[PDB]
């Protein structure tokens, strides 16, 4: 390779890969995007450990060494970061398109200093709530532009996309179709068809709105649906996009006008960073003269809105802080350097303490070392006082697991190996079912209903885990979460068993729509869960391999691939092809093509026909049109639009390329 | 199951080819037995017999139909509660007990029982090994075993054998194993070649039934 | 030790599904496999020629204990008849048999020193 692109979690592991192999000399530079996540995040702390580890290593050799290029938004303590990394600093306020941040109260629009800049009057009045939200969107569209409309909840976005699209139908004509006849009639049709041929299908609300250049966008949608909408909006096919805060931190997506519906997001006042990420998407370089931002408020929330327009970002925290003498991030940082073998003695530990971002701002370290000693993570030998890794230590590092989590996992696995159920895959799935964060709001009454209907083989697994029927009843009768007490990890257990059931149907190739109706969770939450469990399953497998647990490793090593695509064991071979997901793999399997080998000798036009059969239609489906011989109705990654013929031809070509590399 | 005798006429055609008929009913009784124990199917083209999954599995495993019944239940029993921390429980499933490979000294057995680690005592209980029966073996040499439910004897004999197979695949010297258990090197070597074959059978049997986790 | 009624197995399997968890634990702890109950409804194969097929008596015994449970739970004779499918004659003959047997097992436990069990 030359350039490896990683996320934060994956990059930190790769660095650790380089420490065990001493191939640190391969790495020439690291580029960090969004440097403000150094401060506070679910994973933002990994960015510091990553950088600090580099700063500690480059110090042990103290012509060029390791270069660091970091970039972010305007931070108050930005000079502190450049000094910590011994980096030269640069800061600018330049912006090719001037941003006009404003706030609307009633009909009046004010700037940051509460001076009136426009008295707004709606060109055609419509009914509803109407803080001139539709009229504002209409004004932008008429000037042949596009508008981003940010809403608090997922439900408002769909409701608003519906109102706007509905009014767009009445007003243009002055009184679920085909797109109007312009130069783009073909591409609006291509978008809906691409949505149709997806594991999710074509959303009911989108079928109404998309024909009129209107759409919504939130985390409830699948990642493939969101890739389509973002592309459509970026091309101009969609003129109005009602989104959530998910997009504001997502990919680069600019617009002429940005509208924020309210300064109250999720029942709480809006964060400043979120605000700057929304209004930052106003103004297209090379297209617009200005970018306008409008924050709609009332007189009551009037004062709070101005606070955002004048507000500024908070200083970057270290995420390694001391009430408590010990902290998770510190324990982990120390584990990586001792087990990795770059900090052995006691003097090296405090040398590392100098390289931290925490010390750049101007004991606890010794407390973390003892913690690693108490929990058998690290060893001390009598050449006075030198610290070494244990098997539990070396296992934890290679698994990329958190030392705090490793303790409960290690005990739980030993518990499973004393009495294990093998007749189904449920018990194995439970061991690789992640529960460090909530992926959905579980309806407990529904849960209890599935409990009664649950077969005996899976009830045995429930009991073997910790699931008491009494607790499930005490969840439905009273919404008492309790969980203040630490031993009330009892809550996580029932949440974990609920999740494993979902993962069971998922690898049982149950349709996303059935699973949504059965459990009551959207397709967005499911897909986010499987990508989490696929990663976690790999960790527990590595953890079992480094501990010598062969029997346990043997059972786990098949669920990482199955959780990823959501398939059964038979389709594991087909899904090696890039274009083949769960659905396409099944219909090709049911038609005689079981392996890549069977797929390389395959006739292209036959594959094309089989693909046409896996598609979901609203009428019980599955004109001689010689105009659809060229319709690009198949989506890819880094994509050119693919026709059903080209996709079929690519699959057979790819199958052939893989088969040859196997010999 | 092999598919060379399908109908009822073919069965008696086979009866003519036997060595038993060369010397010059019962066949029909065996067919019903295969029906009662779900080994074979009967469809309504009157009266044609077909193999089940249990049938096709038994044939491919080269197992005796009489033995297959107890094996099929025992495996289902193991999959309801299985110990994975050691290889003992797995070895028990592939430990053959259709013939005696040695004369077991029960007093020695009880001595190894007390010294046995907790992880392997859990496997003993999970199988059927009661400490009371081991004591009743040392005190009095009462084999009993006239009653059919006294397959209880085979269980303790089987668990004794699995211990031997455990040390064997743990690369313990043949001389240590001889002194520890009290069996000659001839009996041990004859046992491992028997268990190697049986282990392959149970693996095939598990594969044809779709029991992937167990096969693995 | 004797059959007190002709048990309808399909009805039995229906009561099995509706059975609370506390009583399913007792069923498993005894020998009751759900697979065997299904193989009773699908095919009326009694087998029981083999001695180890005392497995039949176990499911028959657990069926009977359910009846005795409702009986000492003061459930009307008419409900029990409709629920299980046995006449009032067979039930009453059963309880007088179980009352005697219960006394035997109690004495048996007392003479062996099993105080906790006797209690
Ligand atoms: K793929
Ligand atoms: Mg950026």
Author numbering:
A (entry chain A): 184 to 245, 256 to 368, 375 to 521, 524 to 563, 580 to 599, 605 to 844, 851 to 891
B (entry chain A): 540 to 563, 580 to 599, 605 to 776
C (entry chain A): 658 to 776
What's in the article?
DNA polymerase theta (Polθ) has been identified as a crucial alternative non-homologous end-joining factor in mammalian cells.
In the nucleotide-bound complexes, AMP-PNP and ADP bind in the nucleotide-binding site in a similar conformation to that observed in other helicase complexes. Comparing the relative orientations of the D1 and D2 domains in the apo and nucleotide-bound Polθ-HLD crystals reveals a modest difference in relative domain orientation (maximal displacements of up to 5 Å), which would place the ssDNA-binding motifs slightly closer together in the nucleotide-bound crystals. Comparing these profiles directly with theoretical scattering profiles calculated from the Polθ-HLD tetramer crystal structure reveals good agreement between the experimental profiles and the Polθ-HLD tetramer in crystals (χ2 = 1.60, χ2 free = 1.80).
